[PDB]
Design an enzyme around this catalytic site. Sequence first.
Site, PDB file in Angstrom:
ATOM      1  N   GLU A  81      -4.082   2.836  -8.362  1.00  0.00           N
ATOM      2  CA  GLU A  81      -5.417   2.912  -7.681  1.00  0.00           C
ATOM      3  C   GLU A  81      -5.658   4.613  -7.000  1.00  0.00           C
ATOM      4  O   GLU A  81      -6.673   4.930  -6.670  1.00  0.00           O
ATOM      5  CB  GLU A  81      -5.540   2.001  -6.448  1.00  0.00           C
ATOM      6  CG  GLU A  81      -4.831   2.222  -5.297  1.00  0.00           C
ATOM      7  CD  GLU A  81      -5.065   1.119  -4.393  1.00  0.00           C
ATOM      8  OE1 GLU A  81      -4.471   0.085  -4.556  1.00  0.00           O
ATOM      9  OE2 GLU A  81      -5.568   1.274  -3.131  1.00  0.00           O
ATOM     10  N   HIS A  94      -8.822  -1.603 -10.446  1.00  0.00           N
ATOM     11  CA  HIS A  94      -8.759  -1.783  -8.866  1.00  0.00           C
ATOM     12  C   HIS A  94     -10.296  -1.749  -8.575  1.00  0.00           C
ATOM     13  O   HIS A  94     -11.087  -1.374  -8.995  1.00  0.00           O
ATOM     14  CB  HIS A  94      -8.412  -0.265  -8.311  1.00  0.00           C
ATOM     15  CG  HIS A  94      -8.317  -0.177  -6.968  1.00  0.00           C
ATOM     16  ND1 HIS A  94      -9.226   0.340  -6.294  1.00  0.00           N
ATOM     17  CD2 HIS A  94      -7.553  -0.837  -6.057  1.00  0.00           C
ATOM     18  CE1 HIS A  94      -8.913   0.298  -4.983  1.00  0.00           C
ATOM     19  NE2 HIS A  94      -7.796  -0.383  -4.762  1.00  0.00           N
ATOM     20  N   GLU A 123       2.649  -4.522  -5.686  1.00  0.00           N
ATOM     21  CA  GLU A 123       1.582  -3.400  -5.923  1.00  0.00           C
ATOM     22  C   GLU A 123       2.288  -2.202  -5.001  1.00  0.00           C
ATOM     23  O   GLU A 123       2.780  -2.161  -3.914  1.00  0.00           O
ATOM     24  CB  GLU A 123       0.345  -3.921  -5.478  1.00  0.00           C
ATOM     25  CG  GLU A 123      -0.915  -2.855  -5.586  1.00  0.00           C
ATOM     26  CD  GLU A 123      -2.101  -3.627  -5.557  1.00  0.00           C
ATOM     27  OE1 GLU A 123      -2.220  -4.725  -5.908  1.00  0.00           O
ATOM     28  OE2 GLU A 123      -3.329  -2.835  -5.554  1.00  0.00           O
ATOM     29  N   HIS A 172       0.794  -1.294   0.121  1.00  0.00           N
ATOM     30  CA  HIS A 172       0.045  -0.025   0.104  1.00  0.00           C
ATOM     31  C   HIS A 172       0.812   1.200  -0.011  1.00  0.00           C
ATOM     32  O   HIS A 172       0.532   2.212   0.822  1.00  0.00           O
ATOM     33  CB  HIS A 172      -1.134  -0.100   1.192  1.00  0.00           C
ATOM     34  CG  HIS A 172      -2.084  -1.160   1.130  1.00  0.00           C
ATOM     35  ND1 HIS A 172      -2.034  -2.189   1.429  1.00  0.00           N
ATOM     36  CD2 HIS A 172      -3.390  -0.786   0.871  1.00  0.00           C
ATOM     37  CE1 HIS A 172      -3.136  -2.936   1.386  1.00  0.00           C
ATOM     38  NE2 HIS A 172      -3.977  -2.004   1.116  1.00  0.00           N
TER      39      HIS A 172
HETATM   40 MG    MG Z   1      -3.984  -1.699  -3.413  1.00  0.00          MG
END
Ligand code: MG
Lengths: 396, 396, 396, 395, 395
Positions: free
Chosen positions: B260, B310, B234, B210
């Site tokens: 995202e 996403h 990611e 994240h």
């Molecule tokens: Mg994510």
Amino acid sequence: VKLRDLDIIVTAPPAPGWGGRYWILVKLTTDDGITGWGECYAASVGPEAMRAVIEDVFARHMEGENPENIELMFRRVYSSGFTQRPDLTAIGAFSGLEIACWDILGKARGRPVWALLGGKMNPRIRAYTYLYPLPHHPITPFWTSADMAAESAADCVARGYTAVKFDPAGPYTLRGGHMPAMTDISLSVEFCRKIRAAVGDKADLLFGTHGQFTTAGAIRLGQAIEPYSPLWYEEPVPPDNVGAMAQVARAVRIPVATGERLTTKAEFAPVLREGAAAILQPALGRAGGIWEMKKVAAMAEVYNAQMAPHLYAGPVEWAANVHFAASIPNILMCESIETPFHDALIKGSIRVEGGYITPPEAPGLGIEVDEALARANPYHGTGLHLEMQEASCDYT
Amino acid sequence: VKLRDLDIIVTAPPAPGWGGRYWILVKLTTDDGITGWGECYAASVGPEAMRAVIEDVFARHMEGENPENIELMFRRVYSSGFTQRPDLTAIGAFSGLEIACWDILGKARGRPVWALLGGKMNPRIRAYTYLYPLPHHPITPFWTSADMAAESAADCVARGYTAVKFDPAGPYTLRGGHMPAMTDISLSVEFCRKIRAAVGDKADLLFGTHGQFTTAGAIRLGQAIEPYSPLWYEEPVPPDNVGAMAQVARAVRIPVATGERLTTKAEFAPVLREGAAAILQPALGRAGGIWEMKKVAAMAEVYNAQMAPHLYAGPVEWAANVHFAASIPNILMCESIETPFHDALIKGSIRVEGGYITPPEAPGLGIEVDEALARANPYHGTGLHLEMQEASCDYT
Amino acid sequence: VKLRDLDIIVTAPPAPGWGGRYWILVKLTTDDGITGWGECYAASVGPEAMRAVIEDVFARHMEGENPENIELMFRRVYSSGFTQRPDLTAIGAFSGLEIACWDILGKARGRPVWALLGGKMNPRIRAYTYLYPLPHHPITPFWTSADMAAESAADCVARGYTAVKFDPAGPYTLRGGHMPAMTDISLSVEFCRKIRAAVGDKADLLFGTHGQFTTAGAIRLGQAIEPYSPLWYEEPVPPDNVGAMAQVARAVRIPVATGERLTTKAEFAPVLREGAAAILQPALGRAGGIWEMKKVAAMAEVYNAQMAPHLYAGPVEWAANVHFAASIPNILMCESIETPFHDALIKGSIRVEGGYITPPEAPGLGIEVDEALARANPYHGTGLHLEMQEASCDYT
Amino acid sequence: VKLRDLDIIVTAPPAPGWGGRYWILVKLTTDDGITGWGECYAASVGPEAMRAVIEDVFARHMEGENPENIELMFRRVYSSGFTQRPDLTAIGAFSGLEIACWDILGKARGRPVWALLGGKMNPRIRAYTYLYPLPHHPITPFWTSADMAAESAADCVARGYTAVKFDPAGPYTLRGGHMPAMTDISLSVEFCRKIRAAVGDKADLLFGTHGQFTTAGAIRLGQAIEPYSPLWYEEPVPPDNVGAMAQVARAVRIPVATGERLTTKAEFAPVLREGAAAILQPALGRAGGIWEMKKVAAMAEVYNAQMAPHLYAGPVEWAANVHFAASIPNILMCESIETPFHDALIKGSIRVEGGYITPPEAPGLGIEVDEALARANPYHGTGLHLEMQEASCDY
Amino acid sequence: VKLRDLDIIVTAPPAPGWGGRYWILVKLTTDDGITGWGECYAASVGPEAMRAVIEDVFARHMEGENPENIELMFRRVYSSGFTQRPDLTAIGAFSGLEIACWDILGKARGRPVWALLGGKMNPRIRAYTYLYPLPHHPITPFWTSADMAAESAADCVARGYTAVKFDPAGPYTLRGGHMPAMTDISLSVEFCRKIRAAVGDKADLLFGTHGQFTTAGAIRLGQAIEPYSPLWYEEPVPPDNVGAMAQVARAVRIPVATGERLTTKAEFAPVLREGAAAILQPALGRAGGIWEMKKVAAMAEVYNAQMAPHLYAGPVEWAANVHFAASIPNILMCESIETPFHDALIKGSIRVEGGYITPPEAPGLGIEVDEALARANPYHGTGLHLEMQEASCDY
Ligand SMILES: [Mg+2]
Ligand SMILES: OC[C@H]1O[C@@H](O)[C@H](O)[C@@H]1O
Ligand SMILES: OC[C@H]1O[C@@H](O)[C@H](O)[C@@H]1O
Ligand SMILES: OC[C@H]1O[C@@H](O)[C@H](O)[C@@H]1O
Ligand SMILES: OC[C@H]1O[C@@H](O)[C@H](O)[C@@H]1O
Ligand SMILES: OC[C@H]1O[C@@H](O)[C@H](O)[C@@H]1O
Ligand SMILES: OC[C@H]1O[C@@H](O)[C@H](O)[C@@H]1O
Ligand SMILES: [Mg+2]
Ligand SMILES: [Mg+2]
Ligand SMILES: [Mg+2]
Ligand SMILES: [Mg+2]
């Protein structure tokens, strides 16, 4: 102390309305009664939507906080809702609130804001203005009249201004970059020629374009105005493509200036790193406030680049610009707007005198905001602070 | 036809709340009474401020417009108030409204949305999910338990999933990137090892970070998980520095995925150009809507790169993802969340079946939204959809 | 107020002498009697010459000046004598004086220094230490004993430290970079192996090299220690070649840290820009002081890079580090030296507790310098703070 | 032999003081009585502090050493105190001492210094001078008078000079780069136009800027003076940003020259590598001495670039420049200052003749320093050799 | 003094002939009777053609010249006949002659050559050698035997050497780069494994390849030997493509060394600039001589790179290497060949002792060349110093 109260006042400058349709003022009060004023620069959505955004940002990230904690409050808003990349609208909200925090901090410290920002670099700050219609100039014809612009330039220079700004290059539209018409190019040349003839060596020419052009178009227009030695070429292309602007910068012999539509150091850093602009023009009420822009100023230093704080807004954001400018070694000049309403709103607290601004010595931003006057001038319209044309560039 | 009415419904998913605190649904009605549903993904400010933003964007740029005019409506919002660079909040508003326009267009044409987007590329679309706790897993201990994650992974494979996602790498905070703790690295290794052991060749591992990390930190973590052949890494760094992400991609042997928290082709193009990511993960309710993401998908094509839309939101945004995915040659997979509430809100109109999604054949998005269910589940919490921690990474 | 008086005190730490042969302390007094303490880090020439240098810098550029004017005073010294590029000796002199100005400013404002630097970001600051001999270790054999280092690492972990530094890679010499002996590489592996075994996940390993190596040599050593996941690789090459360091950074999977021998933003900016280091380690008493280093910290933010302030000096420079670190979002850790003398010299004003530092709440640097103690411990040697040997690397 | 003694003399040039407020001379004596003279170029701090720095550098790294060991002594000072990156002040101290070592080495070898540096490349070295007021010119108005500058240039040419330098572009200030005023640009154009008309093809114009400008400002000024074919554009930006200077060099059609404020090969190499300058102007008394500058001269060769040794100091540094220049294939020209004091201080040992310099044949630097004269002219000011203004550019 | 006489002596080392088929010695005499010895490294054409080349170079550019004028003589030969770019054959001729000039200069000065090159940096110089057959090793099988190589490596270490070189990677051919056979890679791994086992930490492995490979092949080979921590990867590709060598440098974790087939600073500067090599191995008898390589050493310094002077030639070129190495801060090590003939030809004037070389203190190169012994061993063959085979790599 702790921040406690927020008041938002949206105020409309009287006609002809230099500085836009409305200004968004914020007034913060601490739990011990100290008041600070700030100004937000954000018009993606109208003032009523901006009220809700500002109230949210303040209540969520700032209310109950020590106003000293400027780094922390920036991080909170910048990161809000799992974002942590520039949000043009939310940071516009924060910036105005951050400026009010500095006003509060100066008052609490008993010092001007600049004294808190590494102290005084500049006893006098170079100012400039757009060329505005003189009283005998019809307003609408003025914008495409080189003759009238040259008269305004002569008057600015007589009054001590050492630089003047103008954009004769045609409309900016929502479609994005376009190619200038031949008439846009010839008019731009006519403006530069006549304004240079009117000011000689007494003032610089600032070519104040509004991101109208494709890279190709910006280069064709740029090369045409080179012979008049303009000091800068502002926003030659739209603000959404750093690579395109660096292409213009490499292909025209005029320094490129930009920044009024950019926000936070995350956006200013790449502009410098890619060589897209030599002169940075953040609007402090948009770009993250005074402290964030101090970070950007230091970045500009290591590129041998300079700051020229944007102003197309009220005198509160302008006061922030002045304290910021007073404290940096790499200041070029401060955009300024001289109107009765600008002056009255801060009760003549800070003024351009003979083309220059003296940093105020009083505590905080050194302004007395006429709250009653702002409230006596509400905004009633349905438009945004500024707007972009839908109709295409005219080639006929 | 013309767009006429807007209804905004903010709905709270019931506990445990997979998909966030609330979803922002929008319902558009034309002057001939065709209804369309969309979903906004925007949480820099809360639901009440977003209501005001969405109302402004609709009334200003879209009300009274032909829903066919998707290019034009985007240009209007994108340029609104003399901006013409991405505004995360305003474009988040537009994106949901744009999705509702596609629902309307599909219904007016009598065709599913994908049929309007260059037709069908993919008769079936590969799905994936996060690893969620099984009925016998305690919620809080689950997130840091490699054993429980491996059990969840085996269950996902049993139900036909060919890829699973997890983030065992620690908290994301408002401070920006941090260096992972040694325990963050070891836990990540343990997760990858045990999950790989549990799925073997039957599924890919998606390392669903994240943006917690400094570039240095992302590289140290990335090299440690390479032996387990994760399909993607990611958001290894925060979304505000393309060069930093490109440094990670060059330094780790795992494809980097991101997007995202990005918005518009103006942000996705540099990601591709600098080699920051090989897999693009826009949230269609944030990034500019379906058509804008088609533009990005074409750009990914000329980088031999892929889209993976996403989803950490409701089934309406998901439906948009499905139609988008169905129409592109360069689809990797669609993030999916199976909850009783997700399914009920679209009355089971579209489902994951054996790890894959069949594009719907009904007109529009091919969903029947349970508006009554949405309204029966209002949101009145004080929080944002997702939030970033204030406390630092814990090294003890 | 105005700066009026300067006292310079050179003090020698007693045995075991961690922190070098002597520390150069400066005491400034204003016209109204406020005192501030700083610390210079400069040993190109000995303390007697430095005393003359510091006196010159103060008298020429600082005496009579308002201590608020930190930007201006830096510009004066940095430009002194038509230079305006970094002078390692002159800026070392200024830096200590600048720190004392901050002590004074905090005292005048009645606030801790960090409160004046954008406020508090970090309520606890992560500390680290070098591995020092345990009471049961012979001193000289300790430095090349992997077994003893591991014991000391376990000891640090028991003390609550979450990172430890060590340099087993051999002597630095005046010749410039050299190739490591095979024994240097094997010892470095043995150290990393045994220290990792001793600390597990409880602490990070900091490979604290001293710029001994050619680019080639640094890469050969770096690749050998990669399996132990060291958190950083410090000064892999001499500090006079940014391009060489960037070559190492690209060729090794360990983050590079540097900066203790660098000065001003003019030197730190190319380090970031060229990707030479991910972690910046300025010595504040060398690099231009607190404010100049805030500028550098901001630059590191836009590279997603972090600061780890250097300490191989006294508790006054360390106090500056703590206030600096407290105010920045991108702090990694603060180098610390726990000796009875360091603690006594600031009367235990600021301490490492369980591996972390709490920023002081008292005004200024929040220290009470034991001036009598510093004065009772003069330096009587003929050496420099540190020295580089003449004999070559030993391969036989 | 071994270096044993150091003597430092700070001497002040008589008014009008061409060459700065003071010169820092060093005198080294070996254990067998050979003396060598050098000159330090260092003014971050004043002469008093510099004496202390020089004494330290000599005592710590050079006293007792064989003067042949130039590589080693450089490494010692460069690395001093765990540094090993350029220290402007310490290396300025070393440089003067290093020049003195070469004077000693020449005397011990019975050869001119140039003979020890790979031999003679250049039987005559091209010289240049700044434009200075003629006897009938008022000093203050001269610096902004294009007419008077043109007269001075014509006089220079009549005396055989083939290149002249001038800086009409305004003040350098401690704030860093600024944008030139329109009047700075117009005055610069007027100077170039009138000086070119005065000299025609008989001399080159050297636009001797002092790092006043932002990158943007330097490009705007530079483009305006292009029509007059200036041979170089000196220090267009401050010396602390190689990338910025490279941006100027790419954007103006005039060769960029720089180096007077730089030190050691570690700083000159990046200038070359990045294309920041085509002409390198080290002050040998600052940049690490003669041998360090031979290293830089060799680097300039592989960039098809040239050396133009800086002089805004005494005849001792100038003598170092001449021997350096005599030995290199890639010499452009030597900055020179002709004053009665410069000449008297080295007893007329080396002179510009008809715009050129002949390398001396006598041993060492081939100079006889009038030590008594230097001592009779002490420095009594409180200022630095040169100083940067506090007040901003005037618009 | 002026250069006057040239004598060329081509001498063949007795079997097994370590150091090549023949060495080209040059002997210069000044008009006052000082003698200087040098060595040329040039084999594009045979000894007889080289005689004519050397005679031309000397007579045309050097005869009647003061030997001090090293810069000027290099410029003359480098520019000869409107060239002014590296000519391998012509500069090979100059290089030996230049080395002889340094021998003369040192004799005239009464000092060792290193003392004239910035003085002493290195009191002892690190040496290395190829792995040669031990007396009980059959010569032909040795070159492809990892077991015998490891025995030789263990012997080298017992004698004090701290680095050993070997090339198990296959034949170099006139075709240019080729892909290694799997057996070339396997044998290279076996060599590295067994040599590392025999020497442990007591010595470095130098992987002394001969430019056999394409970029692709060099990368495949390089990655396989990485686990054994070779100190360098020598000439991984042919010497005619800087970009290709830089590709190898970026793709393998071993430092690249090159330079034995390169000539002048004009060729070494791009190698550094492009990051093609971290270690420079000029043959001083080829690359332009001592002074030209000092320029290259200074360039290496600003890349934080090092010199390792090449030797596959006589003790005269080696003497030049030793003086060169003694004077530079950035020396890595000196390639050395210990044979009875090497030692006798310089009468044991300079020797490897316990893996290190002490720079001589006597004037000039500090060698006494056994001219009689050299003339008693003429070259009788029709071959070249070294040769590249015509047959392809064997798969
Ligand atoms: Mg994510
Ligand atoms: O899209 C890239 C971003 O960089 C900046 O130039 C603009 O704000 C734009 O939004
Ligand atoms: O910070 C530069 C821009 O690039 C994108 O990665 C971010 O959204 C940001 O707006
Ligand atoms: O700061 C970067 C360095 O580059 C050089 O140009 C200057 O000496 C400066 O110190
Ligand atoms: O040599 C150039 C500069 O780069 C930096 O790495 C060093 O401080 C040096 O002074
Ligand atoms: O092949 C091009 C040139 O580069 C150098 O590497 C070679 O010597 C050759 O002359
Ligand atoms: O200098 C590098 C090589 O490239 C060519 O330009 C020259 O001939 C030279 O041999
Ligand atoms: Mg503008
Ligand atoms: Mg260190
Ligand atoms: Mg100059
Ligand atoms: Mg070889």
